[PDB]
Design a protein around this nucleic acid. Structure first.
Lengths: 142, 139
DNA sequence: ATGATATTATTTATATGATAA
DNA sequence: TTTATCATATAAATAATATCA
């Protein structure tokens, strides 16, 4: 029998693990580098719900992670001028060289991994990922 | 490209759809994945390797095993040949439980792959293999 | 020299217990 | 509040060398 879904979970596990290994010198947890990775790529005006989903933890879990990152001095959480229940999540000046380390491993690691496959594979695969995700979310609505 | 982030999102939404369809069963995500893998694999397979199939470390598998044993869903009889090795297998009372879990996993996989073509599935399958192997080469 | 074992280190299998996510 | 995790503990099988009535 196919165990395709499980095989896909394993692939993501080992991809993450490889990145986590390469980042071993920063001494950050995986939720930490994944959180910082996503804060950098996502606008500060965006809500915690939207940040939490991209990262893959729940909203309350994100609050705990953001607490840790603020104590470390890597982010600030300041109230927005246009909406007073919303807070902008911004990387601090001093995080800049850490973000460079995380982004570089992530990017290099992807290039190395996808460097071992055909354009057809990459394209067919990239499109399917979007399609299957699309289907599941619909099924979840049903 | 965010292909890693993309794959990770797919994985999580797919698991969450299975979890949702299994809700009335009131098993934690960790329990139902473990039950599924215990049923899939030979009992001779190690605890380190069972954890590998599941996606967890062995201390996390041990407490999960205690809980499942608590519920009388699994036994861990100590191997008569190797007094430090154990035999993990489902009980008879877990028979209708695994039938549920397996049922939902197979039906959901078969459903998710609907609408997509034969050579597209062949790529998803062939690339999990190649990329995992290539990631295993690194590290 | 013999068997009977004993002494120590290595590796493999599983388990626990403080905390940290 | 569970829940999982890190660095450990038992513990049995593995194996190399050593000791004696």
């Amino acid at each position: 029998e196919s165990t395709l879904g499980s095989d896909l979970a394993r692939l993501v596990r080992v991809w993450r693990a490889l990145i986590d290994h390469r980042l071993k010198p920063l001494e950050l947890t995986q939720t930490h580098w994944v959180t910082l990775y996503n804060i950098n790529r996502l606008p500060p005006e965006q809500s915690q719900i939207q940040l939490a989903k991209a990262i893959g933890i729940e909203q309350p879990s994100l609050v705990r992670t953001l607490d840790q990152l603020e104590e470390k001095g890597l982010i600030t959480r300041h109230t927005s001028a246009n909406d007073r229940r919303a807070k902008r999540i911004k990387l601090t000046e001093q995080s800049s060289p850490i973000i460079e380390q995380v982004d570089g491993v992530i990017s290099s690691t992807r290039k190395e991994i996808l460097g071992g496959i055909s354009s057809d594979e990459i394209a067919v695969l990239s499109g399917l990922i979007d399609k299957l995700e699309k289907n599941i979310i619909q099924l979840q609505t049903k």
